[PDB]
Design a protein around this ligand. Sequence first.
Ligand code: YI5
Length: 207
Amino acid sequence: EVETFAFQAEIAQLMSLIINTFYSNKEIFLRELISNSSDALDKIRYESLTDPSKLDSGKELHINLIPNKQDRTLTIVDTGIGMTKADLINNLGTIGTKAFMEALQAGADISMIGQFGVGFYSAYLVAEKVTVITKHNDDEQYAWESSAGGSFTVRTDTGEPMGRGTKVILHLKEDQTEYLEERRIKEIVKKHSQFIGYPITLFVEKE
Ligand SMILES: COc1ccc(-c2snnc2-c2cc(Cl)c(O)cc2O)cc1OC
């Protein structure tokens, strides 16, 4: 009930570079993922203009951020358009990077991943493992997942349903746990993402 796929070569290269780099400016991953969530929300919102049954799976258009120190995960949840099994494998599996890859001339990364369509992968600046959970109106709920190393998996999600949208779960590296800190997140969002056109809500952890 689980399929394994290979990353297109250019993507695996890019990932290996990100995973390893000592790049300082790691917080930019948060801007890339919020930026992707914002695009997905634009998509569903604009589709709903001509066909409001679109929103039947959820009217709220927002972005949630969820630190979990017991699990050492940070989750970004949106209720944008979401991805069918096929968008999921295309979008996360293939490329584009060449641009970027050849962009860091003879060097190691830059805050320009975003302007290059591959900003998602910057998640690997801070995470040893990413899981992507996604619900498009047309399809079932799927879980994508990869610890890098050239392959990802795709299966049908068994967990709580989402109605619609995308959920990006980062399993944080041992020494990047500052992004589970309420203070650091607020600061990061304010710096890189406050002019995003949807509510971004930080969930504070309970005692
Ligand atoms: C163009 O840029 C794109 C941006 C978003 C997506 C998609 S569609 N459904 N979800 C997202 C999305 C994807 C990711 Cl990775 C994420 O972190 C959050 C999400 O809501 C597709 C894009 O390209 C088809």
